[PDB]
Amino acid sequence: KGEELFTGVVPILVELDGDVNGHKFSVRGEGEGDATIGKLTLKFISTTGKLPVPWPTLVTTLLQCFARYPDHMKQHDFFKSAMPEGYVQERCISFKDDGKYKTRAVVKFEGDTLVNRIELKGTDFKEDGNILGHKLEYNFNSENVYITADKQKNGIKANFTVRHNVEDGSVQLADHYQQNTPIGDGPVLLPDNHYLSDQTVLSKDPNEKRDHMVLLEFVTAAGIT
Numbered sequence: 001k002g003e004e005l006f007t008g009v010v011p012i013l014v015e016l017d018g019d020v021n022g023h024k025f026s027v028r029g030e031g032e033g034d035a036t037i038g039k040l041t042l043k044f045i046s047t048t049g050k051l052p053v054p055w056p057t058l059v060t061t062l063l064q065c066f067a068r069y070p071d072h073m074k075q076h077d078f079f080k081s082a083m084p085e086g087y088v089q090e091r092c093i094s095f096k097d098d099g100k101y102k103t104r105a106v107v108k109f110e111g112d113t114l115v116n117r118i119e120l121k122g123t124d125f126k127e128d129g130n131i132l133g134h135k136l137e138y139n140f141n142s143e144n145v146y147i148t149a150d151k152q153k154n155g156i157k158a159n160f161t162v163r164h165n166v167e168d169g170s171v172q173l174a175d176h177y178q179q180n181t182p183i184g185d186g187p188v189l190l191p192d193n194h195y196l197s198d199q200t201v202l203s204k205d206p207n208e209k210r211d212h213m214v215l216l217e218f219v220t221a222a223g224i225t
Contacts, residue, residue, distance in 0.1 A: 020122030038068030076191035085184030099125030
């Protein structure tokens with residue numbers, strides 16, 4: 001029945017308030033989600049000017065409820081089962097040989113709009129590292145998000161590592177530890193182990209004067225037969 005909220009195109013609003021090593025920034029995003037084909041289209045604007053961190057490092061933070069779950073694993077879709085009341089999504093993102101992001105997001109409906117409101121705190125970053133030094137290429141390498149149930153705590157956990165291309169040819173690892181917990185009290189679907197296959201593409205809007213990121217995502221659940 002949370003499923004029923006995603007049978008069509010859903011408008012999306014994203015708000016991120018960030019602080020990395022004391023550098024404050026704000027991001028606003030809007031777009032739409034179409035879970036029938038696992039498709040997300042989003043455009044994000046910096047409302048505080050040039051970001052202190054590379055746009056690619058924020059992609060995972062900025063709506064896995066829009067993943068396409070094949071009919072045969074629809075009883076494993078925690079994200080939609082927590083709707084409309086929503087879920088809290090928390091991560092620690094550990095950048096190898098560098099600092100960490102800690103994020104807490106509330107994802108829930110407000111009327112017909114799905115709203116993702118995020119707080120991000122970054123600490124322990126090197127002033128001349130790949131992140132604060134803006135050494136990461138504007139691109140993305142997609143792979144699988146591995147999901148497991150956390151029954152004790154009535155939610156899920158996810159783990160994955162993002163490989164960020166560095167301008168000098170090296171790779172900057174970002175170790176993601178993720179937890180999701182429902183906001184409502186009613187029962188939710190808790191999954192068997194599976195994964196989300198991601199396809200992520202970053203672009204620019206040639207008509208946009210503000211610092212910004214255009215994001216296109218295709219997400220499909222897999223791994224259960």
